Amino acid sequence: KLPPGWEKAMSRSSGRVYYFNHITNASQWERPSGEPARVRCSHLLVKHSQSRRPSSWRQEKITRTKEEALELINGYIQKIKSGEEDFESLASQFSDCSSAKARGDLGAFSRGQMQKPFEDASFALRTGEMSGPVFTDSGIHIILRTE
Ligand SMILES: O=C(O)CCC(=O)c1cccs1
Numbered sequence: 826k827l828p829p830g831w832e833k834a835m836s837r838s839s840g841r842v843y844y845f846n847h848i849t850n851a852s853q854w855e856r857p858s859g860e861p862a863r864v865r866c867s868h869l870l871v872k873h874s875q876s877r878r879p880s881s882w883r884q885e886k887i888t889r890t891k892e893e894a895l896e897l898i899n900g901y902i903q904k905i906k907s908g909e910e911d912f913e914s915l916a917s918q919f920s921d922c923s924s925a926k927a928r929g930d931l932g933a934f935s936r937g938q939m940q941k942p943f944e945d946a947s948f949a950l951r952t953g954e955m956s957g958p959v960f961t962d963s964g965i966h967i968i969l970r971t972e
């Protein structure tokens with residue numbers, strides 16, 4: 826049937842079927858079609874007051890709530906998916922990670938290096954695919970698999 830990680834779902838507003846990935850939190854209308862030692866990813870991080878280090882190059886003291894951080898992430902995802910904004914542009918401007926200065930690029934990595942939710946989402950993404958919101962101890966991430 827469906828590839829692992831994917832499940833069929835129903836739009837509440839339209840009744841149209843869609844597909845949801847519970848490892849990446851990605852959702853899409855089309856049926857996903859069915860692992861390497863290493864992947865390369867970029868990401869955009871939004872931190873919140875409960876982040877492991879609630880501070881970034883953008884803000885000495887990060888005070889936003891987790892719910893506020895999720896709303897910002899959701900808004901960035903909308904603009905990326907509509908093409909109004911580029912992932913790399915939003916990461917350079919608004920990512921609370923030091924990788925913002927590199928358009929969010931993390932380089933290549935193996936399993937066992939990254940926090941587990943981030944690692945699992947990165948390796949379940951197809952090349953070129955974007956995640957939905959991914960939660961870690963650092964905050965909330967949008968992940969783009971580039972290689
Ligand atoms: O933070 C850690 O414990 C390991 C590195 C890690 O997971 C990430 C750093 C940038 C994106 S996710």
Ligand SMILES: [Cl-]
Nearest residue numbers: 889893894897
């Ligand atoms: Cl804010």
